[PDB]
Amino acid sequence: NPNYCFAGKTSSISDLKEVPRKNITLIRGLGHGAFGEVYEGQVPLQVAVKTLPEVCSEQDELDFLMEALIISKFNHQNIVRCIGVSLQSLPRFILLELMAGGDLKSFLRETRPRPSQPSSLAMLDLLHVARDIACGCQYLEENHFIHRDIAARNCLLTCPGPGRVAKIGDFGMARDIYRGGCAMLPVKWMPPEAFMEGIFTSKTDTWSFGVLLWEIFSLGYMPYPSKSNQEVLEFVTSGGRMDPPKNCPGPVYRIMTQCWQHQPEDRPNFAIILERIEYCTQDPDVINTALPIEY
Ligand SMILES: CNC(=O)c1ccc(F)cc1[C@@H](C)Oc1nc(-c2cccnc2OC)cnc1N
Structure with missing residues (x-):
């Protein structure tokens, strides 16, 4: 054993x-x-x-x-x-x-605002999910555990309803490294030094969290729309970054772009990320922004 x-x-x-x-x-x-x-x-x-x-x-x-x-x-x-x-x-x-709410990716897609459900989700709901996962990430960071696959598919919700709490629910990637192939690596969630040099630090999870944030505010879209893994690899390595999700507040997008700084030392730790998420939740111009209604 x-x-x-x-x-x-x-x-x-x-x-x-x-x-x-x-x-x-x-x-x-x-x-x-x-x-x-x-x-x-x-x-x-x-x-x-x-x-x-x-x-x-x-x-x-x-x-x-x-x-x-x-x-x-x-x-x-x-x-x-x-x-x-x-x-x-x-x-x-x-x-x-x-976790009765199931996984976060499916939730976002299933719970998108619609003509039938015009107010199924607000900016504050998304900010609370982001805060919840960032709290989990900060815990891993301060205990020196690197998750290696922070992504919507690996997060769960306690319940479908407004009091939902988000948690990290899968640790399969970290388990594998502790002890596969290129085509299974979560390249669309990985920073340049990770897929190039195989170097992982806590700043790896910061980059991934940025991508999760995009997933959350896009309401469950696949990152880098229309791009394959290798196209993403080359895009990100050349300095390319995702556009803001539809209707995304600037302050929220700015958190994403800071998580995606090329140099890991330039990316925020999770204490700072949580600070910035908190500031967003206080800002009326952010939380009063309406999410797109999908027809
Ligand atoms: C099929 N998904 C997973 O296995 C899966 C995917 C990601 C993840 F982080 C953890 C899991 C499994 C291990 O754990 C759980 N899944 C659900 C759950 C998941 C999906 C739909 N309904 C559910 O509960 C009603 C609820 N609670 C869990 N502890």
């Missing part, structure tokens, strides 16, 4: 909270796609159940064990909680906080 170190503390599979299999009930599927299915479940405490295929390799097993260790060792309101694991029965389970 591999050890895991976070914040200078070491943990082992023995530290994982094993939940007796008899206490766990599956309710419905939520998704598969990526390696492993996820179900809604009960332990009555409601959970999302990530499963390990019984038909897997030794490495798949170690990967699964490692993400369990990673998530269980985090303690922050904007990172999905791990209720525990069930590793002593097959298929093996990781039990997560059930």
Whole structure:
């Protein structure tokens, strides 16, 4: 059994909270796609159940064990909680906080303002999501953990409604690096030094957060519209940056452009990002800006 170190503390599979299999009930599927299915479940405490295929390799097993260790060792309101694991029965389970709002990317697309739902979303809703994730990122930063794939698809919402809280919900990329190919790398979320020299720092996540911010204020569009991975790589390496999302307030766009500074030392840390998001939320001209209504 591999050890895991976070914040200078070491943990082992023995530290994982094993939940007796008899206490766990599956309710419905939520998704598969990526390696492993996820179900809604009960332990009555409601959970999302990530499963390990019984038909897997030794490495798949170690990967699964490692993400369990990673998530269980985090303690922050904007990172999905791990209720525990069930590793002593097959298929093996990781039990997560059930985020009823689902993933952020799908939410943004599904919840875009429409003629039928003219006020489904406001600038403040987006700013609050951005703040929430930036808070999670600041926690990772101050604990020297580099996420490596901050993107809408990896964020979850506690509920569809106005009191929703956003959290980082997937750590698969970080898990892989802790221990794939070019075409699977999240190049559209990566800074120049990352995909060139394979250098990662906390400023990597700052760049990625900029792209997430664009995803949020575009209401769930794929970054760099119409560009392939290699076109983005060449575009960004040459100094190219995304335009503002439709109707995006200037102060918000400016946060994006600061996250995308070529030199990592010129990019803000998350304390500063949160400061700037806060300032945006106070500014009437920002939050009174109407989001586009999709016909
Ligand atoms: C299919 N998506 C994932 O597996 C997925 C994608 C990104 C991510 F960060 C975490 C997950 C899975 C591991 O965890 C969760 N998914 C949902 C959930 C996700 C999608 C739709 N409805 C849901 O709950 C009602 C809710 N809570 C979770 N703890």
